[PDB]
Amino acid sequence: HPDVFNILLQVMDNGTLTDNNGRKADFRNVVLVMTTNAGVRETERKSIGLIHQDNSTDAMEEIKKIFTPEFRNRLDNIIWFDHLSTDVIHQVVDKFIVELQVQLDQKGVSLEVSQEARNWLAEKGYDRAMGARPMARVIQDNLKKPLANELLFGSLVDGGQVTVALDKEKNELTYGF
Amino acid sequence: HPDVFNILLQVMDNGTLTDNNGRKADFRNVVLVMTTNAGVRETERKSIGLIHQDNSTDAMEEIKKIFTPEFRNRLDNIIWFDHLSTDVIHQVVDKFIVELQVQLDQKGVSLEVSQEARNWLAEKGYDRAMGARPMARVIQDNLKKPLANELLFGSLVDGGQVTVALDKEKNELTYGF
Amino acid sequence: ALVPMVIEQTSRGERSFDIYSRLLKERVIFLTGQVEDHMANLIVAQMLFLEAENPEKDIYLYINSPGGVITAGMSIYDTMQFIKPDVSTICMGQAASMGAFLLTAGAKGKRFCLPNSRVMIHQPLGGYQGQATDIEIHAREILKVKGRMNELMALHTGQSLEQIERDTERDRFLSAPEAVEYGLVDSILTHR
Amino acid sequence: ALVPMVIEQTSRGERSFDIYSRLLKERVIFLTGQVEDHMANLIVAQMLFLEAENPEKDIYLYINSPGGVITAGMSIYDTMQFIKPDVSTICMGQAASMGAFLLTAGAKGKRFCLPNSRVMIHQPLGGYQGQATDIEIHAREILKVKGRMNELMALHTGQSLEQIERDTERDRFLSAPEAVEYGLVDSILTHR
Amino acid sequence: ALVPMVIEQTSRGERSFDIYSRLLKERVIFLTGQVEDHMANLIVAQMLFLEAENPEKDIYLYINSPGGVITAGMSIYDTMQFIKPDVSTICMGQAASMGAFLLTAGAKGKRFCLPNSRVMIHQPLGGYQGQATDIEIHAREILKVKGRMNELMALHTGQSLEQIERDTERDRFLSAPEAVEYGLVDSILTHR
Amino acid sequence: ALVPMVIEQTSRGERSFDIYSRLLKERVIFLTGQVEDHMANLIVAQMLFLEAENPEKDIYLYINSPGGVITAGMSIYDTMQFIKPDVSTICMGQAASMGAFLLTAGAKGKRFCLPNSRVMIHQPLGGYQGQATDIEIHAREILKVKGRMNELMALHTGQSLEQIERDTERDRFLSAPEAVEYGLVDSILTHR
Amino acid sequence: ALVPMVIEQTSRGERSFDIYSRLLKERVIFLTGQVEDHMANLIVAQMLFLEAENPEKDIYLYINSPGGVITAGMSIYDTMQFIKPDVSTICMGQAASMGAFLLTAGAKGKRFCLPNSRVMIHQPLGGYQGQATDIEIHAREILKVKGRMNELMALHTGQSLEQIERDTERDRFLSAPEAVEYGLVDSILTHR
Amino acid sequence: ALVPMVIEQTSRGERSFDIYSRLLKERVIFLTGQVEDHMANLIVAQMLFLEAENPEKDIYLYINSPGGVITAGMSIYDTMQFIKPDVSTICMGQAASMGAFLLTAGAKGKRFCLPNSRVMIHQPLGGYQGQATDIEIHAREILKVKGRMNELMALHTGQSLEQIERDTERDRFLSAPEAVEYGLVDSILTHR
Amino acid sequence: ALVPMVIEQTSRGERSFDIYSRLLKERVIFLTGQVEDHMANLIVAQMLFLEAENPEKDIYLYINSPGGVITAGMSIYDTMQFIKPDVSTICMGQAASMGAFLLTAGAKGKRFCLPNSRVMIHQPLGGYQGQATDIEIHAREILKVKGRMNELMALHTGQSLEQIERDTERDRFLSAPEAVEYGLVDSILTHR
Secondary structure, three states: HHHHHHHHHHHHHEEEEOOEEEEEEEOOOOOOOOOOOOOOOHOOOOOOOOOOOOOOOHHHHHHHHHOHHHOOOOOOOOOOOOOOHHHHHHHHHHHHHHHHHHHHHHHOOOOEEEEHHHHHHHHHHHHHHOOOOOOOHHHHHHHHHHHHHHOOOOOOOOOOEEEEOOOOOOOOOOOOO | HHHHHHHHHHHHHHHHHEEEOOEEEEEOOOOOOOOOOHHHHHHHOOOOOOOOOOOOOOHHHHHHHOOOHHHHHOOOOOOOOOOOOEEEEEEEHHHHHHHHHHHHHHHHHHEEEEEHHHHHHHHOOOOOOOOOOOHHHHHHHHHOOOHHHHHOOOOOOOOOOEEEEOOOOOOOEOEEE | OOOOEEEOOOOOOOEOOOOOHHHOOOEEEEEEEEEHHHHHHHHHHHHHHHHHHHOOEEEEEEEEEEOHHHHHHHHHHHHHHHHHOEEEEEEEEEEEEHHHHHHHHOOOOEEEEOOOEEEEEOOOOOOOOHHHHHHHHHHHHHHHHHHHHHHHHHHHHHHOHHHHHHHHHOEEEHHHHHHHHHHOOOEEEEOO | OOEEEEEEOOOOOOEEEEEEHHHHOOOOEEOOEOOOOOHHHHHHHHHHHHHOOOOOEEEEEEEEEEOOOOHHHHHHHHHHOOOOOEEEEEEEEEEEOOHHHHOOOOOOOOOEOOOOOHHHHHHOOOOOOOOOOHHHHHHHHHHHHHHHHHHHHHHHOOOOOHHHHHHOOOOEEEEEEHHHHHHHEEEEOOOO | OOEEEEEEOOOOOOOOEEEHHHHHOOOEEEEEEEEEEHEEEEEEEHHHHHHHHHOOEEEEEEEEEEOOOOHHHHHHHHHHHHHOOOOEEEEEEEEHHHHHHHHHHOOOOEEOOOOOOOEEEEOOOOOOOOOOHHHHHHHHHHHHHHHHHHHHHHHHHOOOOHHHHHHHOOOOEHHHHHHHHHHHOOEEEEOO | OOEOOOOOOOEEOOOEEEEEHHHOOOOOOOOOOOHHHHHHHHHHHHHHHHHHHHOOOOOEEEEEEEOOOOHHHHHHHHHHHHHOEEEEEEEEEEEHHHHHHHHOOOOOOOEOOOOOOOEEOOOOOOOOOOOOOHHHHHHHHHHHHHHHHHHHHHHHHHHOHHHHHHHHOOEEEEEEHHHHHHHOOOOOOOOO | OOOOOEOOOOOOOOOEEEHHHHHOOOOOEEEEEEEHHHHHHHHHHHHHHHHHHHHOOOOOEEEEEEEHHHHHHHHHHHHHHHHHEEEEEEEEEEEEEEHHHHHHHOOOOOOOOOOEEEEEEEOOOOOOOOOHHHHHHHHHHHHHHHHHHHHHHHHHOOHHHHHHHHHHOOEEEEEEEHHHHOOOOOOOOOOH | OOOOOOEEOOOOOOOEEEHHHHHOOOOOEEEOEEOHHHHHHHHHHHHHHHHHHHHOOOOEEEEEOOOOOHHHHHHHHHHHHHHHEEEEEEEEEEEEEEEHHHOOOOOOOOOOOOOEEEEEEEEOOOOOOOOOHHHHHHHHHHHHHHHHHHHHHHHOOOHHHHHHHHHHHOOEEEHHHHHHHOOOEEEOOOOO | OOOOOEEEEEEOEEEEEEHHHHHHHOOEEEEEEEEEEHHHHHHHHHHHHHHHOOOOOOEEEEEEEOOOOOHHHHHHHHHHHHHHEEOOOEEEEEEHHHHHHHHHOOOOOOOOOOOEEEEEEEOOOOOOEEEEHHHHHHHHHHHHHHHHHHHHHHHHOOOOOHHHHHHOOOOEEEHHHHHHHHHHOEEOOOOO
């Protein structure tokens, strides 16, 4: 509720907040980070006309309308995160694959993914609109589901490892032991 | 509030009102009397036009336009209590004068209120829109303020014959004793 | 905004009404300008509407009119004598010709006229082009209307018919006090 | 605000209707002015609408009309005869020509005129320029209409055809008592 | 208030619809006056609207029209044949020229005229000023239309083409029973 | 957008209103342009409406008018005199002819005009064509009106009648300070 | 009811639409009558509006138009080519001149014509009064437009340019099947 | 759709306001086109309305006007001087004649003019037909008005009266920079 | 339903907005038809309104205009230069005369033109009747305007002044590619 923001005026400005017993919270050694999706619904909307408009000034409307001037004027900064680029997606995919590798290592099996397979997953899952969020699903469907069957029903348990590669004809992934 | 109205209809239909403690009030032995002033408000309004017309209405219709038929259909009646006649307002002022005299008798003061004074107070206090309600004030001030003053100042005594003639300008022609 | 809105408090007090509708609600109808069919039909609709709303209350008809079509005026004339509640007519500005005709047709004792208003009366006008045979028919038709109009004036004013017959031969103008003396109206409204 | 608004209570009372709509709700339709196609298409829409609302109740049609197009009048004429509830026609002001035709077409026993109204009847008018061959076609067309108009008048008035035929050769004006005697209407409404 | 409002109850009851919209809701469309492009454009839109609302519920087209532009009328004609539900055409007052054309184009067995309607048919009218070369182009253009209209009349009425051509050489008026015999309509409505 | 809407917060909401209705609530009526019957009829409706709203408060009439029909103006003139609350008339722009007449008719001590306004007074205009007998009647009536207007000017201004008689034979223009000296207005408004 | 209202069952409530707004929601735009600046401007606004609502769905342009101003039509033409969704055009009634021009400009495979509609094409008209040098300038401009229009006709119809030029020197009328063979439209809609 | 609606969030909701009302709310009044009585009357109503809403805040008057009736313009002129808040006038497009007159009448230091706007000043126009005696009266009145306008120009511009007298003999056009030097405006707005 | 309504969901629910208002919200303004005072007065109001809504976003001005009054156009011209956000002008249909003038006045790099649109430029027109002295004054003013317009054209297009001076002697038509080369616009929009 926007009135809850008022609680932070004295926090951001004096590092303090007083509890109902009269004791004071001391935030001088606290880093305050607030996150938001304000302005996104608007920045992602298509305009009507021959020329598409630049809707990057979301900061000028939603952030300003939501946060009272006295709140805003106490911030060190308002930082706009961008949509992730495709270069980033490749890095994101590598990151998620590593997370997968760790979960697999804990079960005594390991996973290798070819570069072609990685590029394919990255290319398949990219959606500028949803950032890095869907990449975890692309990995979930292309790597984790196959693996769960191999891990759960004996194909890939103790004694083996799995290598995943992309073919070119179908651009389908391989698996193994 | 409409939920008073709704609970009254529920009582009219089943004879009971249920308490927070599960206790039930039994209305089979009671008489419900409701009052309303709706039928007297419309009649006191002046019409727009060179000729004012008669805005007398049917009070029963005014009720019809305010109250629901579910309510009306659960009544034994809707009764019009009319305005008061001259002799009635005299009965009312005389009752007030007698009560005044009782207070004066407790002190021992005899107050003679002329018939002209009695008629006038009844006429002045009475308001056909508010009936006899204002009579309390025409007598409370006109027949008492001067007595309180002569008694408290000490010009009037516990006893004595004090009279109030009314003059042609309708003034209280009070006396000492 | 040719016609302003007014706001009236009631129970909810949300209603706004063109000032003319606000006055219709008080049983006030305004007849202005030429009497024609569309206007008259609207006045008749208003009178029938008020008769239905409350048959027991007077309807006030404000007249400020130079005259008009007799036929159209007669639909007002007859509605006024048909509907149950009295129609009280008030002349302001002018009531000429058919306008005067309707003014005197109000309920007896309730025909009023503001003091600087003018009332004018005169035999009906008309005309026709055609064969001598058709001319005769139409001439007979206007004379009957004249005669009928003369009979109704005498009825409503108390003047003898012969006197009405003479007085409408040529335009006759009456000041508000003259309208009262003549019998077109009962009285003059002056100040509230 | 040419046409005033009226307020009617219901339950909530949230009803504001132009006076014309308010009276339609009381099953009153006004037919006024020249009878043409757009107007005599609204009269029909209203009658069909009222028939559906309650097939068992009368519809009151107020007529104040100088005449008009026969064709347009016939869509009204046929709708009145087709639908179930009686249409009671009331003459105010005038019912001339096509207007008189529709007046007599109301339900038997329910046709009436206010006392100072005027009803006028007469054979149809028309015309046509073109080749002698086309003139004959169009002349034949108007005579068939005249004949058809005469049959329907005789049907509704009770006059013989021969008599109704003679009486419409030239404009014939009838006073309200004459309309009753003749049979165009059944009675005169006087006072409510 | 040229067009009255009607109130209809539902669940909550908050429905106030112009009387013509009230009738559109019942699948009734009115074609009146001259056939032109804006009118035709609106009728087509209404028919498509009704077709979608319920593809299996007749649409009633009330016709009272002197004629109009063929081109505009053909967009009504084509829409009526295109759309799935039957369009039942009713002739009231008149259906002349293009109006007659559309009347006969209604669904077979569902075409009918009130007892006093007139239906009139006749070859297309037109014209053109310009150079003899342009006159020739436009003259051929109108003759093709005439031929095309003649084929459609024959198709819908059941008359042979030669007969339908002879009969439209000059204006031909048909009374309601004549229209039935000719085949312009299937029947005559009489009384509820 | 010819007339802009304004909003005001009172109890539970904004209530937008045509700026002209917003001012009617403040008991401000504007009279502008020609004085005619429909305009005058509306001003009277507004004054009666305000009188009922609160009989004890002044009504401000803003006048900016070149003149107009005397009859229509007298309708306004008499209502102002009849109704209980004072009508305070303010002249802005111009008050000519009948406009000046109404300006002086406001409540004494409350008649005022802006510094650069102009007030113009003159005897009434009119005319008639017809038989010498009718000319005589109509000429006599306009003279009675002139006399009547002359008396009312003298009454409201304090001028002798003869002085008014002389001053209005030909158009007379008065600057705001002259209107004050003459007695048409009581004062000049300057700055708040 | 110049334009009927309809109501729609969706989720939150029926609201109401005036047919054309109702059809705009279905991505149907109607182009009728003469093409001029204001109407063209409105169509462009509607197409931009629909393009934004859903860039992946076709827009249907119903055409029934005699022609119009090329410039105005040119703004429609360019918007149709610019916007992402295909614009499917349907010719009903007529598509003449500029109307025909826009008809063929719809997405290939989606140009439809109803069976009895007529399409007419011709070179542009214009004119100018002034000095011989001013005439020279304007003559060149109209010729450039003619050339430009022929280039676009050839592009959209598949006819050679040489053939388009010959075929538009004089008005050319095409019936729906002729338009298909010529290539102005792709197919004829018949029955659903 | 001549004037678009705009929506602005307020407190408990948002409100849709004709763009012209949306700007009145910001204390912006637009004076455009000829100055006449009805338009002037509306500007006066707007200024009085704004004065009451906040007597301590400036009112902006945007002028784009060729001139008009002096009388009507003076009512605007006097209201601007009477009301408490400063009226800041801005000339855009043109301010000619009476428009120029009102432009210079704004609050000193707040009279602004856009860079390409033109201001034009000239003695008043008028005329009269009648008897030599009436001509004489009317000629004197126009001359008094001329003198009066000359006095107000000198007052507001700082020019001597003699200089104003010479400069308005014939139309004198001033570019925005010339208006500043002359003293009609205080400054030129350029870019925000 | 001349202008369709569109509906969009926002926060609390859906809002119905004339399609023209729906586009104003997208910062799209249409300038079509003749440039005159009332039209300019409205465009300026819209631009001021959008500037306030969000000073940092572009305003799109769609132009399809044959020309108009220079004065009115200059108020648009000055507002565009004054307000902070860029105004991006797009030419569709035509931008002639004053329309072309405003087209080039858009923000540099943002002047766009659809491919089949025409842009036409010429020296200003005008005229005057009167005494030789007045003729000189008015001739002097139109020439100053011509000079002034010539400077602004050179400023915005990058052409030398002398070249602009020569090129506007007589109407010059430019195709969209020519407008780009000349410098009236920056680029041509083709397909999305």
